[PDB]
Amino acid sequence: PPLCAAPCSCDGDRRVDCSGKGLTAVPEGLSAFTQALDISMNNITQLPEDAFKNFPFLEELQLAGNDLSFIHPKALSGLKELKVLTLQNNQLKTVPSEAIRGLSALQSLRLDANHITSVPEDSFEGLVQLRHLWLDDNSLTEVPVHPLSNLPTLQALTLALNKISSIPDFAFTNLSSLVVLHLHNNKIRSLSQHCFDGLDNLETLDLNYNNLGEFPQAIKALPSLKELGFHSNSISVIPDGAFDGNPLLRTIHLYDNPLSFVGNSAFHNLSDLHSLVIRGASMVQQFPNLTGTVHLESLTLTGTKISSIPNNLCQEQKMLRTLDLSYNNIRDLPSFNGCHALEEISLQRNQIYQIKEGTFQGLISLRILDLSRNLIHEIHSRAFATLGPITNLDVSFNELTSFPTEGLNGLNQLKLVGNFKLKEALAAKDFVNLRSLSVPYAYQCCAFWGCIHCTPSTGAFKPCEYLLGSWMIRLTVWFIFLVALFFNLLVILTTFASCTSLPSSKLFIGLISVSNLFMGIYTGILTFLDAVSWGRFAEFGIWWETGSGCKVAGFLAVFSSESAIFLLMLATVERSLSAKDIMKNGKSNHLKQFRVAALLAFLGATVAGCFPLFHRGEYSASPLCLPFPTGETPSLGFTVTLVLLNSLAFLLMAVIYTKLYCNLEKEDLSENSQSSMIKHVAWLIFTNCIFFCPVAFFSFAPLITAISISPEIMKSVTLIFFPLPACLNPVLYVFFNPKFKEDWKLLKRRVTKK
Amino acid sequence: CKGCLSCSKDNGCSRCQQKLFFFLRREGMRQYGECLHSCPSGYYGHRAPDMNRCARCRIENCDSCFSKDFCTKCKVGFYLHRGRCFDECPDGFAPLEETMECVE
């Protein structure tokens, strides 16, 4: 390395780097030939007079981050070759005009981030070579018009991060050579009608983060303007003719603004404009004219009351690439033939209702297209015929009853959620490139599984091939259907064919079995429906789910299943009353009362099945058509509603039995006939309780997130335990009750006699 | 980590001083932010209320640029006219070599 004065280094070629040394005074021992000096990141607090006498040839001087506070006015005497001066990160608090008076050759002055509040009027006098100026991050409240009036050669000026709020007229009337002006992040809210007059060479203006509530008319005198930014402001109204005076604009920034109304002809005759984004223009209802604007690349209009689209859009714009018109009131779609450069279209949340065949005739570069949340109910079968590399499509939340498929082999993302009226299935041969898919009904996802994220998931609750699934599961439902039906119908004939005075104990046994038969016929629906759709349940799954049959089957299942519980406990009170009347009265006169009480349970069960009809989708939770899988408050909160009484019911009908058990004496059951009746009923309450836990215990699993249960096991136990009491109940009356034995003998004589 | 309010080893400096410029330093597959008193060549400062970050000079063929579209000085062979890089001076402007810019 070239020799240099310690402790700092010298690059050579009259370049000296003595920055970051913690010094508080100007370094010495440097050759007068030096042209550049950097002594930043030091502790030089104050500049003594003639600090740079032995150094005539500098052009670069750096003083950033030195906590400078005072400079001697003559400390910079003799430096006539300086061009660039950096004085940021200090505590000047004021521009040292006197010290910089003799800097004739200065071109770039940096004075930002120094807590400057005000400047003298005679500042910058004689600075004939100045071109750039850093004046951001200070406490300036007024624009130093008079000091700035003496810099005709200035080109770049920034006044960011300052407390400037108002700009008077002719604030920069002498800045002929000015090119770019920065004013972002300031407290400006008012602008005079002629604040910017004279800036004929202005190209770039920035006004972001200000308080302009009204659009300034002073901009109309900026013929050379090319880029304007005033986003993140309080602008609300863009009147027509605002951009009359600046016909060479290229890029604009107006987002993050409370704009409501926009002039109809505001943006016309702007050839060089490239982007256009409007959001929040609620008061706008008419399409802004675009005559004279033929180079827009991106067009976006959101939150407007625009109803129609002019037909000349695709014939005027040529290189338009991305178009968005969401959040509006568009009803009809004009012909899009011509927009060859178009690539993406978004028309979500509009009043469109139909799609015509020619609506997308001319599109060749389309890749992404969205129509979510519209009123579409019909689509032409050849609507997507004349399309090329279409990749992403979304028409979710609509009312299609069908879906054309031709010309969609290149699709990758497809979304159909919300189309409740769509029923048919989609062939996989047409969607070989499909990757992500969402459909209104899970059974539609059965074809595309590859055994490709298809939603909603086709879980075990909604199988595709086999309804029951497991072969050994399948036999049990077939097994239970036969035994339950045959025995149930048999016992009814025993009791009701005898023209004898039926007691209460015999009666209640009849109704439960009568009600129980409905489980058998309900299970028969399941085994038959599974058999018909053997290995092909998916195709019938959707129709069966939404069809009226599932409602009937669902209503049938809940009715009798509840009917048993709301009625078996009637036997308990009857048995207790009969037991109590044995040693109290010896006879029962409540038979009519029980007959009355018998019917009310059926109606109570009837309203249990009617309730899911009020809230649509309650029965449609699963193809099993049995409110049990996790659902939604209407259904979810309903599902817990049924089980709570039955679980509650299983406390009472037990305690009186225990209460009577303590009450009765042990020898009382030795030979009395009521022992047979009381012992028989004791078993139905025994089984119906224990077999009701697994269905009840599994229903609370979604409320207990600590335990996760596999859906296949979830479905399995319901298919084997929920209707299990149906088959089991008549077996006890047919193989254990001695009373039925004599009843079977009674009808045996009756059939032979007849 | 020099002059950094919150510096690490992998992420490097995560937040410089309130007035000091924060620049993301990328070295091959290793990248970490750091603190620099001013933007280096090919970069222009962007003062913001939250914090200050170095911004690459998008302006073509420019060594150091003043702002988004204004260049302090371009490279050799590309003259300076209104802060722009031009191989030759346009009509009405004469070439200048020693100080490398356009003149009348």
Q: Are strands B43-46 and A354-355 parallel, antiparallel or unpaired?
A: unpaired
Cβ within 8 Å, pair A64-B37: yes
How many angstroms separate the CA atoms of A290 and A268, rounded? 5
Q: Are A361 and A386 in contact (CB under 8 A)?
A: yes
Token digits of residue B27 = 């070295």
Q: How far is A108 from chain B (nearest CA, A)?
A: 9
Distances from the Cα of A735 to the Cαs of A679, A686, B56, in angstroms?
13, 17, 92
Q: If you ran DSSP here, which 8-state letter would residue A288 be given?
A: P
**Packing angle, helices A504-532 and A537-546, rounded to 10:** 130
| Number of CB atoms found within 10 A of residue A21's CB | 17
Please state, as a whole number, how many other Cβ atoms lie within 10 Å of the Cβ of residue A230: 24
Distance from CA of B31 to the nearest CA of A (A): 24
Give the span between the Cα atoms of A508 and A496, in whole angstroms.
Answer: 12
Q: Is A237 left (phi over 0), alpha (psi -120 to 50) or beta?
A: beta
A518/A525 Cα distance (integer angstroms): 11
Taking each helix axis from N to C end, the angle separating A591-614 and A633-663, rounded to the nearest 10 degrees, works out to 160
Alpha-carbon distances, residue A450 vs A410, A453, A538, A711 (angstroms): 18, 10, 16, 21
Q: Are strands A227-229 and A204-206 parallel, antiparallel or unpaired?
A: parallel
Best of A136, A161, A180 to disrupt the B interface by mutation (most B CBs within 10 Å)?
A180
| Token representation of residue B21 | 């410029």
**Interchain pair A204, B48: CB under 8 A:** no
CA distance A574 to A593: 10
Q: How far apart are CA B71 and CA B89, in angstroms?
A: 16
Q: How many CA atoms lie within 13 A of A62 on its CB side?
A: 18
- Cα–Cα distance, B24 to A268 (Å, whole number): 42
For B67, the closest of A86, A89, A180 (CB atoms) is A180
d(CA A107, CA A177): 13
Q: How far apart are CA A513 and CA A520, in angstroms?
A: 10
Judged by CB atoms closer than 8 Å, whether chains meet at B67 and A204 is answered as yes
Distances (CA, A) of A705 to A18, A458, A702, A708, B64: 66, 22, 6, 7, 60
Tokens 């406990």: give the residue.
A569
Given a contact cutoff of 8 angstroms between Cβ atoms, the answer to whether A421 and A400 are in contact is: yes
CA distance A484 to A471: 20
A136 vs B contacts (CB less than 8 Å): 47
Q: Which of B57, B67, B81, B102 to probe by mutation at the A interface, max A CB count within 10 Å?
A: B67
Cβ atoms within 10 Å, residue A705: 7
Are residues B70 and A180, on separate chains, in Cβ contact within 8 Å?
yes
CB contact under 8 A, A185 and B70: no
Mapped onto helix, strand or coil, the DSSP state of residue A16 is: strand
A7 vs A22: CA distance, rounded Å? 10
**Measured CA distances, A205 to A277, A308, A335 (Å):** 19, 35, 39
Q: Do B48 and A137 touch (CB under 8 A)?
A: no
- 8 Å CB contact of A204 and B66: no
Q: Minimal Cα–Cα distance from B81 to chain A, Å?
A: 11
From CA A467, how far away is CA A488, in angstroms rounded?
26
Closest residue of chain B to A181, computed from CA coordinates: B67
Rounded Cα distance between A84 and A67, Å, is: 19
Q: Using the 8-state DSSP alphabet, how is residue A635 labeled? A: H
What distance in Å separates residue A233's CA from the closest CA in chain B? Answer: 15
Phi, psi of A378, rounded to the nearest 5 degrees: -145, 145
How far is C-alpha A560 from the geometric centre of its chain's CA atoms? Answer: 42
Asked if the Cβ–Cβ distance from B48 to A185 is below 8 Å, we say yes
User: Considering only CB atoms, which chain A residues are within 8 Å of B20?
Assistant: 89
What are the φ/ψ torsions at residue A237 (nearest 5 degrees)? -130, 130
**Cβ neighbours around A534 below 10 Å, total:** 11
Instruction: Name which of A179, A203, A226, A250 to mutate to probe chain B: the one with the most chain B Cβ atoms within 10 A of its Cβ.
Output: A179
Question: DSSP characters for A407-472?
Answer: T-TT--EEE-TT-TT------GGG-TT--EEE-SSGGGGGSS----EEES---TTS-SS-SS-SHH
CB A106 within 8 A of CB A125: no
The shortest C-alpha distance from A148 to chain B (Å) reads 19
**Cβ–Cβ below 8 Å for B47 and A86:** no
For A41, which residue in chain B has the nearest alpha carbon?
A: B37
Strands (E) across B4-90 are located at: 4-7, 13-16, 21-27, 30-36, 43-46, 52-56, 62-65, 71-74, 79-81, 84-86
Q: What are phi and psi of A362, to 5 degrees?
A: -90, 5
Looking up tokens 């924060």 gives: B22
Residues of chain A contacting residue B82, judged by C-beta atoms under 8 Å apart: 155, 179, 201
Minimal Cα distance from B3: which residue of A? A41
The answer to whether the Cβ–Cβ distance between B37 and A136 falls below 8 Å is no
Give the span between the Cα atoms of A176 and A168, in whole angstroms.
Answer: 18
Q: Cα–Cα distances in Å, from A427 out to A423, A441, A544, A577, A640? A: 13, 15, 21, 66, 40
Q: Element (H or E) spanning A591, and its range?
A: helix A591-614
Question: Hey, what amino acid is at B3?
Answer: G
Q: Could you give the maximum distance between any two Cα atoms of chain A, in Å?
A: 144
Contact between A483 and A498 under an 8 Å Cβ cutoff? The reply is no
Axis crossing angle, helix A673-690 with helix A633-663, rounded to the nearest 10: 150
* DSSP β-ladder status, B84-86 and B79-81: antiparallel
Helix residue spans in A156-256 (DSSP H): none
Which stretches within A119-208 are classed as H helix? 145-148
A372 neighbors A345 (Cβ within 8 angstroms): no
Pick from A358, A366, A370, A380: which is nearest to A416 by CA?
A: A370
Q: Residue A655 in 3-state DSSP?
A: helix
Give contacts of B38 with chain A, Cβ < 8 Å.
Answer: 64, 86, 88
User: What span, in angstroms and rounded, lies between the C-alpha atoms of A344 and A325?
Assistant: 11
State which amino acid sits at residue A65: G
Q: Give the integer Cα–Cα distance in Å for A642 and A648.
A: 10
The string over A120-154, giving b where at least 16 C-beta atoms fall within 10 Å of a residue's C-beta and e elsewhere, is eeebbeebebbbbbbbbbbebeebbbebbbbbeeb
Backbone angles phi, psi at A374, to 5 degrees: -130, -175
How distant is the Cα of B11 from the closest Cα of chain A, in angstroms?
24
Identity of residue A474: R
- Check CB contact under 8 Å for B83 and A179: yes
Contact yes or no for A713/A473 (Cβ under 8 A): no
Break sites following residues in chain A (C–N > 2.5 A): 451
H helices present in A127-271, as ranges: 145-148
Task: Give the CA diameter of chain B.
Answer: 55
- For A3, residues 6+ apart whose C-beta sits below 8 A from its C-beta are A10
B residues 12-31 closer than 8 Å to A (CB): 19-20
Q: Which residues of B touch A161 (CB under 8 A)?
A: 47, 49
Q: Do A112 and B47 touch (CB under 8 A)?
A: yes
What residues form DSSP beta bridges with A10?
Answer: A16
A64, A160, A179 member nearest B70 (Cβ): A179
Contact list, B69 vs chain A (CB under 8 Å): 180, 203-204, 227
Residues, chain B: 104
Contact A156 B66 (CB under 8 A): yes
User: How many angstroms separate the CA of residue B68 from the nearest CA in chain A?
Assistant: 9
CB neighbours of A6 closer than 8 A, spacing ≥ 6? none
Assigned token pair, A226: 């090319």
Give the tokens for residue A63.
């003083």
Q: Which of A343, A344, A341, A325 is nearest to A333 (CA)?
A: A325
Structure-solving method: cryo-EM
Using alpha carbons only, how large is chain B's radius of gyration in Å? 17
From first CA to last CA, the distance across chain A in angstroms is: 131
Check if A225 contacts B (Cβ < 8 Å): no
Burial label, A6 (beta-carbon count in 10 A; 0-12, 13-18, 19+): exposed
Interface test with chain A among B18, B35, B39, B66, by most A beta carbons within 10 Å? B66
Per the DSSP assignment, residues forming a β-bridge with A110 are: A86, A134
Using CA atoms, how far apart are residues A109 and A100, in angstroms rounded to an integer? 10
For this entry, resolution in Å reads: 4.0
Nearest CA-CA partner of A58 in A81, A38, A77: A81
Tokens of B15: 């937040």
CA distance A133 to A328: 46
* Spatial separation of the C-alpha atoms in residues A257 and A169, rounded to whole Å: 26
Inter-chain contact A64–B19, Cβ cutoff 8 Å? no
Neighbours of A642 (CB within 10 A): 20
CB contact under 8 A, A156 and B68: no
CA distance A641 to A653: 19
Residue A102 to residue A79: CA distance in whole angstroms = 8
User: Which among A494, A512, A466, A525 is positioned nearest to A712, based on CA atoms?
Assistant: A466
Q: How far is CA A287 from CA A260, A275, A290, A328, A462, in A?
A: 14, 17, 9, 11, 48
The vertex-B54 CA angle with B41 and A256, nearest 5°, equals: 140
Q: Please answer whether residues A161 and A185 qualify as being in contact, where contact means their C-beta atoms are separated by less than 8 angstroms.
A: yes
* Dihedral sign (CA A635, A637, A643, A646): negative
Contacts of A182 in chain B (CB under 8 A): 67
Report whether B85 contacts B78 (CB < 8 A).
yes
Taking a C-beta distance cutoff of 8 angstroms, is the pair A334, A311 a contact? yes
Nearby residues of B29 by Cβ (< 8 Å), 6 or more positions away: none
Rounded to whole angstroms, how far apart are CA atoms A483 and A488? 8
In one-letter notation, the amino acid at residue A159 is: L
Q: What is the 3-state secondary structure (H, E, C) of A676-730?
A: HHHHHHHHHHHHHHHCHHHHHHHHCCCCCCCCCCCHHHHHHHHHHHCCHHHHHHH
Distance, CA of A609 to CA of A553 (rounded, Å): 10
Find out whether the peptide bond into A456 is cis, omega within 30 degrees of 0. yes
d(CA A163, CA A161): 7
Helix then strand then coil, in percent of chain A rounded to 5, is 35, 10, 55
Q: In angstroms, rounded to a whole number, what is the distance separating the alpha carbons of residues A677 and A670?
A: 13
> How many whole angstroms separate alpha carbon A331 and alpha carbon A323?
17
**Does the N-terminal peptide bond of residue A7 adopt cis geometry, omega within 30 degrees of 0?**
yes
The CA-based dihedral angle spanning residues B48, B54, B60, B65, taken in that order and rounded to the nearest 10 degrees:
70
Window 127-166 of A: residues touching B by CB (8 A cutoff) are 132, 136-137, 155-156, 158, 160-161
Chain A CA closest to residue B20: A89
For an interface test with B, give the residue of A132, A200, A205 to mutate (most B CBs within 10 A): A132
Residue numbers of B between 34 and 73 with CB closer than 8 Å to A: 37-38, 47-49, 66-70, 72
Show residues of chain A in contact with B37, CB under 8 Å.
40-41, 64-65, 89
Instruction: For residue A733, report the phi and psi dihedrals to the nearest 5 degrees.
Output: -70, -25
- The whole-angstrom separation of Cα A133 and Cα A108 is 6
| Sign of the torsion angle spanned by Cα atoms B60, B65, B70, B74 | negative
Angle at A153 between CA A148 and CA A156, to 5 degrees: 75
Burial class (CB in 10 A: 0-12, 13-18, 19+), A619: buried
**By 3-state DSSP, what share of chain B in percent is helix, strand and coil, each rounded to 5?**
0, 50, 50
| Chain center to CA of A614 | 29
Q: Locate the chain B residue with the closest alpha carbon to A137.
A: B47
Cα–Cα dist A663/A672, whole Å: 16
Look at the block and give the residue holding tokens 């890749």: A367
In whole angstroms, what is the distance from residue A10 CA to residue A20 CA? 13
Distance of CA A601 to CAs A127, A389, A619, Å? 103, 64, 22
Query: Which of B37, B80, B99 should one mutate to test binding to chain A, selecting the residue with the greatest count of A CBs within 10 A?
Result: B37
Other Cβ atoms closer than 10 A to A708: 8
Q: Which residues lie across from A298 on neighbouring strands?
A: A275, A322
Query: CA angle A469-A475-A481, nearest 5°?
Result: 115
Distance from CA of B18 to the nearest CA of A (A): 11
Asked if B38 lies within 8 A of A108 by C-beta distance, the reply is no
Which tokens go with A491? 């016992």
How is residue A164 annotated by DSSP? -
With both helix axes pointing from N to C terminus, report the angle between A711-721 and A692-699 in degrees, rounded to the nearest 10: 150
* Residue recorded with tokens 């108002």: A166
Contact B70 A161 (CB under 8 A): no
Q: Which residue has the tokens 């649509």?
A: A616
CA distance A413 to A452: 10
Among B48, B49, B69, the residue with its CB nearest the CB of A204 is B69
Q: How far is CA B53 from the centre of its chain?
A: 11
How is residue A634 written in tokens? 């209407």
Place of tokens 């077999």: A691
3-state secondary structure at position A592: helix
DSSP string, A302-362: -S-------TTHHHH-SS--EEE--SS--------TT-TT--EEE--SS---EE-GGGGSS
Rg of chain A over all Cα atoms, to the nearest angstrom: 45
